[model samples]
Target: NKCDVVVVGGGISGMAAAKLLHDSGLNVVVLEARDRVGGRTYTLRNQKVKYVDLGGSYVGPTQNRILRLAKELGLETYKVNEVERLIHHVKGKSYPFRGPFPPVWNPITYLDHNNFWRTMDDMGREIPSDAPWKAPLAEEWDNMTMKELLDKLCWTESAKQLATLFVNLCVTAETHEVSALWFLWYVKQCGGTTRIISTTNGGQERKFVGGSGQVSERIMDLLGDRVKLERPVIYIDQTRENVLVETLNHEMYEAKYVISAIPPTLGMKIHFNPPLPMMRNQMITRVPLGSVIKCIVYYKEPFWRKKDYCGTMIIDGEEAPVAYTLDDTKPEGNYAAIMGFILAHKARKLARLTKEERLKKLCELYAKVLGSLEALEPVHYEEKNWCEEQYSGGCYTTYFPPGILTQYGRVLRQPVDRIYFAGTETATHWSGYMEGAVEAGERAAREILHAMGKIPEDEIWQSEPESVDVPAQPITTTFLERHLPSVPGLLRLI
Candidate 1:
């Protein structure tokens, strides 16, 4: 019942924390709500294909922690060649563009579209690698929405549509709903948006040869007997000397440190001693949970990739069934897999349909964008409805309206008493990503180690340090004007 450290939730973060604490010679116990670990990094082995990642899939080069851990675990990684050509359907017209192109139409093409690309290049040049969050004109642009920024930039109707589409895809929400400041901050965090786009070299993306689950499995293996599955900790009472955790079955366990790896939304369910602070509870209620439904359809072969297409399609308009599709075929492929990502309000609406209805609608939508529907009428379809899930309640996390990133991001990640938080949501870099989950978990473990006197406070791994060059300025609309031009055509449509 008692241990030096106890980790709650069996996701990658929890597993990582448990692994690190155990490795440090502490008595660690992992209590997973689910029957198995890995959390959102789920891999389904049901079709003709050997493995299909139903949860988090892509891994980036800068996300070194995940890559290093995978290598250390002897897991092979294959290049993600699936993102080749992106096909966009908007305003009753569909156009296919090659990889590395901005998601929107070239604005300069109308008044010399070449100028738009050139301007983008100039903007890219202006973005400092170390401090992109501080826009060259931060005083004017931070308060504007991405759409507003595009309008000010003199973008044409088509260009504005393209920008909105790109932002929507990134945040998986409507353009107007997301904060422009947060978007710029994210670009800065990733080094630069241009850097993110240009890094199409094989080094930019990698996926586990077997499945992402391999990474979690390796961490769990290191934990050995310390992990207890189906033991959901329903209650925790933290005293000065020890913390007691009680499962739904009425069983009790005690520990010195309690690390919560559950998502912020679901973490609210666990009864905390002295209760969570009012601000933290407000975050639990207001923070947007990634309401996405990921559908993985298996085909007998990689037929779509043969057409020089990455099996990607962007559907616009009110009735667009599938938002986007990515080729997720395994390396030693028996069958090819395609993933359909539906997000936010639309995703919630789609969950209402029966499985058969959903599949039928998908076939119709795929036929509209791609050439045929034959390959999509799969032998079977696998769907993961995160909204209906009891443990996670959602897929990835998302930023809320009115700048929750600036308001509650730090508070959401802060520790209370003997309880510490760890999850992809709390991650500083790559938040809402699998890499972030690992980063947050490792950081949480280090914090616990430091608290227990297992290591010096300075030795604890912290989130990536803030860039020195980032200017201190209040985010405002004026900051956006300097970055964008005046485009009246685009503003009318939105």
Candidate 2:
């Protein structure tokens, strides 16, 4: 019943932490709420297709950790590679966008973009990963929403739509819902807004060869039965010698320390014997899990490709959900895979639609960009909604609203007594990606190791401050008019 360490939530973070602790000679056990591992990285399979990642399907650029880990696991990956052209659909008009700027904005859009990125890059460097609350202009910046930042820029509605839609895709939350300071820190965590938003060399650039979930699956295999499934944790009873972790099914795990690797918002649901610190409680209560619903459409073949379409589309200013899409079909396979992110307000609104109505709505949106009725006849389709998930509470990651980051934010990652925190959310860099999950878990493991004198002070994990100082290199533009694809983007939840 007891182990040296008990890792809760067998997602990427838990698996990573348990693996390191176990291999390091500690008796480690992983307890997952779900029957399966992988957390946000869910891979859906059908008789027609081998792999379709419904969650956290990207890994690249500053995310060297998971790439390295996947490689170590004897897994391979490929570039989400090329996107044909970015499609902008809105207000009964479909604009086949090829370049970085929407055709309507023209030359001024370039300067606006530069201004935005330059501002984000400059301010992003100021928000220290660990001490985001203590940044020089922390309070002022944290008090403002991204919408307020746009107002300060005096950017037009079109410009704002372009930027906001991109942000919507990235965080699964609207610009107004997150703090400007939090956004900048995120940009820093991601290396820049471009790095955060782009596909080729950034967050959506690459996926594991089989599926993104394979990372956790492989880790689970190595972990064996040391990991328990469907064990939803209900309470954590802390004692002077060890912690007692109780599950909903009444099973108990005794360990010297516990690594709570779920999103802070979900962590709030679990009862603590002595209760969390006021600051941590405030953080758990205020930070809402970002909304995201992943939609996958499987056609008999990559039809959009044959139409000279690179299978990418982004919609802004109302048509549907500001949803965007990408081609996720494997090359060696016969299926035509298109994935979309139905996000935030759109996701919330559409979750009420009947399943058939939802499909029709999504396919209609696709038809506008694909310019084909064939979009309506996907041979197979599926979706994963993070909002209603019992364990996760939401997807992508949790975000700080205006002022919350600076207020009661310092204790977000600091552990209490024998409890530790590790997840993509608690990471210093790459906070919403697979890399951050791995890094944060490693950091927790190292901290625990150092505390037990298993590692020296120098070897204790330290996270690098998130920065936008270095510019990212291009991953190779797609063929012709600067290409693209859809990214978080839909499901029929109701």
lDDT of each: 0.68, 0.78
Model 2 per-residue lDDT tens digits across residues 139-202 = 8999989888876763556667777876687778888999988888887877776677666656
Clashes of 1: 21
lDDT: worst 10-residue window of model 2: 483-492
Give per-candidate clash totals: 21, 12
Tens digits of per-residue lDDT, candidate 1, 1-494, equal: 77888898888888878877887888989988888888888887753656778778777656667665676778766766555566777766667787555344344434323234334434545444324334574434445666565566544556555555555655666666666665655554544444443324312356777788878777788878788889988898875467899999787888888899988877677887878888787778766555778887777776666666677677766677666676666666546766787776778798889988887777677766766656656766787777777887776565555445445555766888888989887765666677778888998899888887778988766544321222112222234324443344345546
TM-score of candidate 2 on Cα atoms, chains taken together: 0.90
Give the TM-scores of the predictions, in the order they appear: 0.82, 0.90
